[PDB]
Design a protein around this ligand. Structure first.
Ligand SMILES: CC(=O)N[C@@H]1[C@@H](O)[C@H](O)[C@@H](CO)O[C@H]1O
Length: 344
């Protein structure tokens, strides 16, 4: 049973690793190491070496049996473009594989994660396969030479097995992945947000009149032949916010006029403050989700109830477990506790 949390190093000032309740997790990820083009000598951001080093011993103080992984990449065009440059260059791939393994070992991480959004189109998937093929070979060789247990290898995946459901240009090679990776982190969120001019459930578990749901995505990996234990269901600890066109239209599907605070996203903790400050919270049973609104601000997120429901779902579907992005966004570890209690 995998209980996974992502900690972003950029949150270090407001939420250092010591604040993580690691008793609620089996694995904690450090996000993110840099690809560092053009050499592709992977590294943590220069000047953060101490933070990277202290991460694992720190989180193990509260839970000595917790394991850690370091994630390489992240979202955005720069990371995507750098993966694309890297994967097409055999020499660069060799430098990446060598430096990534060294990076994990340097700081005492138990594994590596690749966060590439996204390996499309077909050429990019094929070249990513080359990278992972070489990385897995090196991981096994490093275990034999060192006498240590091999590093874990995971990767972030789109909510759906096809890239993309509406226009398929490539797809995740599920048998390759099941063979080479310990698990995948399914990003079952950001289905809806301020890029749309209507409010919606940003991480809907299901929806009777929509294909953008966690369940539809999970079903697609399972249909493709992925062993269910290889799938780890992502749950956001943030919500997507909109500014309402009309303050008296406050339900799902209400017209909107742009991103709410802060640039279209609020942490769960910020959403708690929003409610304590007068916002009305609604649970939407149709989508298995929450939303909250006050004046012209509307936010959709996962709450205590929807998280319990999503974790039970993951158990029903026989998944490997769940992950949260990102742990700094729930300062009192409200949702990680509910999730851990639900699975146990
Ligand atoms: C489920 C999905 O694909 N969601 C994406 C979202 O991640 C992205 O931020 C947005 C804006 O480009 O476009 C959506 O289609």
């Amino acid at each position: 049973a995998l209980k996974v949390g992502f900690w972003p190093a950029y949150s270090v000032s407001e939420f250092p690793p010591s604040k993580i309740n690691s008793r609620l997790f089996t694995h904690l990820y450090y996000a993110f190491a840099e690809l560092n083009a053009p050499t592709f000598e992977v590294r943590v951001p220069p000047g953060s070496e101490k933070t990277a080093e202290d991460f694992t011993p720190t989180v193990r103080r509260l839970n000595p049996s917790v394991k850690t992984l370091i994630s390489i990449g992240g979202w955005g065009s720069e990371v995507r473009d750098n993966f694309a440059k890297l994967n097409s260059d055999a020499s660069a791939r060799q430098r990446f594989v060598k430096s990534s393994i060294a990076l994990a070992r340097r700081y005492g991480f138990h594994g590596l994660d690749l966060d590439y959004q996204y390996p499309e189109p077909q050429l990019e998937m094929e070249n990513f396969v080359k990278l992972v093929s070489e990385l897995t070979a090196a991981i096994r060789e490093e275990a034999r030479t060192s006498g240590k247990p091999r590093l874990l290898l995971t990767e972030a995946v789109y909510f759906h097995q096809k890239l993309f459901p509406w226009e398929v240009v490539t797809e995740y090679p599920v048998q390759f992945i099941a063979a080479g990776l310990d698990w995948v982190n399914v990003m079952a969120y950001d289905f809806h947000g301020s890029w749309e001019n209507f409010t919606g459930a940003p991480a809907a578990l299901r929806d009777p009149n929509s294909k953008f749901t966690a369940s539809v995505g999970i079903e697609s990996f399972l249909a493709a032949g992925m062993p269910p234990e290889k799938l780890v269901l992502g749950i956001p600890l943030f919500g997507r916010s909109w500014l309402l066109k009309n303050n008296n239209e406050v339900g799902i599907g209400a017209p909107a006029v742009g991103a709410g605070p802060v640039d279209g996203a609020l942490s769960f903790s910020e959403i708690q403050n929003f409610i304590r400050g007068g916002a009305r919270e609604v649970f939407d049973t149709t989508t298995v989700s929450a939303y909250a609104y006050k004046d012209n601000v509307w936010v959709g997120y996962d709450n205590q109830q929807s998280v319990a429901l999503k974790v039970q779902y993951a158990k029903e579907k026989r998944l490997g477990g769940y992950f949260f992005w990102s742990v700094n966004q729930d300062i009192d570890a409200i949702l990680p506790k509910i999730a851990s209690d639900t699975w146990g």
